[PDB]
């Protein structure tokens, strides 16, 4: 008589079988984490962390392992590129294998709790019916969670007894796992300050322990117990679902806008770094500093790191992919091989021309060369349009500085047109489109996919909060009402 | 005028059933030190050696566990490098920083005249001041008026609004039996901890040898 | 129902079903903590939004 969408409500009044299905879900989730990491370790290429990082290869669980301090592998390599001798058990493979062993043990524990459902612990001594004292259970679980929250902040993050967390510079070129001192001032509320992570978990953990002491000692008010239906297991389901989508909306914005918990060396750059020219402005700032030192343009642009130039490329923008463009970022433009250098375009009048950069909105953007005033000087016309300001007519030459083509000058129109198209996407790079049979359409980073999954999951969990919230407050009439 | 009349009005009312009726209160861990995992773990049956001989062992476990808890905290503080400011002995030119934080290192470097003052304070506490009363509970050696944190049954705690809750002896984390049990268990764990830190130091020079 | 060693241990932790504080209890304290939490959440939102510019904290990527 139970419909298909109500089959799991047999567990609603069975605390022993409720632990069993929760242990089974734990076994599947821990099993997924070990399996996802093992599959990811099979397809990971750790050869070049500069132009082929984890986020270019579609690594999903690997950035979260590296964020908390797991950077070495049993194969002798590390995420930073430095060859490691002995990582111990807590390598990438050891973390993956432990989640598999934990999955099997939870699977066996789920079987025991399913079979031995009728425990005296779940029975109310006054009535003999199955009962769960939910306010007391909340105090136990809040105390246990706050102990873990405090211990994670005080020992793991601060490095007192722990590895620390991933920290980097403002441009993501020197990233490493390092102990982080807590920031107790107003700077701890800067989301990009990693010191806030340590100070939050210590402060919130302490307050949660104090709240756990209160919730383990003081019983709920009678009027609050009746209003919130605290004797019903569905009222905590509705409230936990609400807290769950509340967190998922925050972690979606934190991932999308960037924070200290989502570094660009693990998840890739954000779309707002390309919008504001974040890496571009720093690149010209370092070049202009070298020019004032007396270096020529060739050597000034040669000091620019390839990692910094790779960030200033629209193919690394997470807002450039597609919903059904599956696979890694290397499946798109290709696997990055070498920075080609910075092209400088010039007409026959010595005017320095800059290609107008492509906004993330446009799938295709017109190729336009403008001077320092802002007037359009050269063009790449649309297909067979009647050209008047074309590259051939204007006569634009291109000089490359830095990279592989350092010092080279290209003046023939087909190569100038080809590099003007590549200059529209930011820094010019050479790509291996044959290893993965890359098709040339841009894909999204792990930063883009996480936000899509968790903002959509949070939206769907808002619906579940309304449904399970209504089922709690209307439990008496949910089989129907009386005829009047 | 007695200054305690506001306490009764700030006192929270007795907890009831949700329906409205009075709550029905509705096991084998009666003695302090008898805890859920092992219960009464008495392999040698010291409880069967006599009530006088068993009363001796309760005070003996309490005293041994109390020094071991202080001893463990002392080594963990000094081996970490935490020191008092100034001099330990201005006559011997002994700064606090010069003395090793290790157990054997601190035991030898502290002067014997300084060690005598520690021992005599313990002797003064053991023989006159903090003497065990046979009528009093085991381990209750602090006399009245020596400003000790006590948790009697029904003692008052205070909430955010100023309301007052009375804490029974069986309350979690706040009752007397919880704190009495936690003193005994942390004393038992530090008892094994301090002798383990001694032998790991004897073998490697590191009291916490795997760590560090 | 089955009695286990762990079930006997955890038995007092699930023995207070239906026990409530009479009347409004500590709802007034809870409302104050909820109101303080609401103000705190608005503060860290407006800091991230740059609607509150503090003294020398800058919402931008930091070094070290």
């Amino acid at each position: 008589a139970l419909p298909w969408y109500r089959v799991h409500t047999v567990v609603l009044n069975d605390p022993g079988r409720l632990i069993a299905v929760h242990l089974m879900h734990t076994a599947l989730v821990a099993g997924w984490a070990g399996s996802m990491a093992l599959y990811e370790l099979a397809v990971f290429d750790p050869s070049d962390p500069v132009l082929n990082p984890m986020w270019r290869q579609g690594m999903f669980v690997m950035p979260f392992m590296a964020r908390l301090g797991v950077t070495d592998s049993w194969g002798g390599w590390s995420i930073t590129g430095e060859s490691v001798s002995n990582p111990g058990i807590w390598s990438f493979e050891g973390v993956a294998l432990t989640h598999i062993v934990l999955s099997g043990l939870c699977f066996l524990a789920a079987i025991w709790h399913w079979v031995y459902w009728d425990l005296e612990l779940f029975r109310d001594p006054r009535t003999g019916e199955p009962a769960l004292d939910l306010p007391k259970i909340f105090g136990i679980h809040l105390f246990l969670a706050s102990l873990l929250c405090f211990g994670f902040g005080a020992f793991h993050v601060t490095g007192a007894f722990g590895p620390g967390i991933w920290v980097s510079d403002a441009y993501g070129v020197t990233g490493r796992v390092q102990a982080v001192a807590p920031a107790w001032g107003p700077e701890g509320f800067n989301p990009f300050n990693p010191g806030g992570i340590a100070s939050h978990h210590i402060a919130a953990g302490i307050l949660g322990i104090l709240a756990g002491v209160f919730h383990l000692t003081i019983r709920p008010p009678q009027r609050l117990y009746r209003a919130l239906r605290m004797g019903n297991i569905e009222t905590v389901l509705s409230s936990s679902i609400s807290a769950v989508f509340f967190a998922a909306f925050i972690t979606s914005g934190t991932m999308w806008y960037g924070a200290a918990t989502t570094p660009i060396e693990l998840f890739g750059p954000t779309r707002y770094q390309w919008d504001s020219g974040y890496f571009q402005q720093e690149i010209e700032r370092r070049v202009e500093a070298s020019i004032s030192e007396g270096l020529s343009l060739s050597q000034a642009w040669s000091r620019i790191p390839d990692k910094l130039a790779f960030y200033d490329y629209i193919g690394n923008n997470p807002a450039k992919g597609g919903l059904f463009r599956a696979g890694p970022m290397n499946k798109g433009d290709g696997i990055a091989e070498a920075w080609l250098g910075h092209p400088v375009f010039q007409d026959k009048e010595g005017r320095e021309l800059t290609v107008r950069r492509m906004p993330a909105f446009f799938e295709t953007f017109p190729v336009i060369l403008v001077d320092k005033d802002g007037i359009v000087r050269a063009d790449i016309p649309f297909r067979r349009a009647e050209s008047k300001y074309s590259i051939e007519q204007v006569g634009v030459s291109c000089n490359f500085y830095g990279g592989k083509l350092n010092g080279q000058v290209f003046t023939d129109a087909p190569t100038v047109k080809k590099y003007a198209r590549k200059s529209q996407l930011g820094e010019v790079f050479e790509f291996d489109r044959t290893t993965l049979e890359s098709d040339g359409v841009f894909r999204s980073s792990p930063r883009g996919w996480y936000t899509f999954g968790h903002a959509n999951f949070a939206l769907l969990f808002f619906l579940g909060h309304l449904w399970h919230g209504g089922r709690t407050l209307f439990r008496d009439v949910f089989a129907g009402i009386g005829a009047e | 005028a007695k200054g305690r009349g506001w306490l009764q009005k700030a006192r929270i009312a007795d907890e009831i059933d949700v329906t409205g009726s009075q709550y029905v209160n509705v096991p084998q861990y009666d003695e302090i030190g008898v805890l859920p995992p092992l219960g009464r773990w008495d392999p040698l049956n010291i409880k069967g050696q006599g009530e006088a001989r068993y009363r001796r062992f309760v005070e003996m476990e309490i005293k041994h566990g109390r020094m071991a808890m202080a001893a463990v905290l002392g080594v963990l503080t000094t081996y970490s490098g935490i020191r008092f400011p100034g001099y330990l002995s201005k006559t011997l030119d002994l700064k606090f920083e010069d003395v090793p934080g290790t157990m054997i290192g601190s035991w030898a470097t502290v002067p014997v005249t300084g060690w005598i003052q520690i021992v005599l304070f313990v002797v003064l506490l053991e023989a006159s001041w903090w003497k065990q009363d046979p009528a009093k509970a085991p381990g209750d050696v602090v006399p009245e008026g020596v400003w000790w944190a006590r948790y009697p049954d029904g003692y008052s705690i205070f909430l955010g609004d100023g309301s007052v809750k009375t804490v029974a002896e069986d309350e979690l984390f706040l009752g007397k039996t919880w704190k009495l049990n936690a003193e005994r268990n942390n004393g038992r764990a530090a008892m094994m901890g301090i002798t383990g830190m001694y032998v790991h130091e004897l073998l490697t020079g590191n009291p916490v040898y795997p760590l560090g | 129902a089955l009695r286990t060693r762990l079930g006997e241990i955890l038995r007092p932790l699930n023995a207070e079903y239906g026990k409530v504080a009479p009347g409004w209890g500590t709802t007034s304290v809870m409302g104050v903590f909820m109101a303080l939490f609401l103000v705190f959440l608005v503060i860290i939102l407006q800091i991230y939004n740059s609607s509150i510019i503090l003294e020398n904290v800058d919402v931008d990527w930091v070094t070290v």
């Binding site: 990582p87 111990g88 058990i89 007894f161 | 995992p37 795997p210 | 009695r3 286990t4 060693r5």
Partner: peptide, 30 residues
Amino acid sequence: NAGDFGGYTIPIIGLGLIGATIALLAGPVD
């Protein structure tokens, strides 16, 4: 990296402690 934070000591002692407590609580009462 191996040998940091006690090496394999704490995971071995921790896993042995969990296994011993499960075996201690596995027997029926009375």
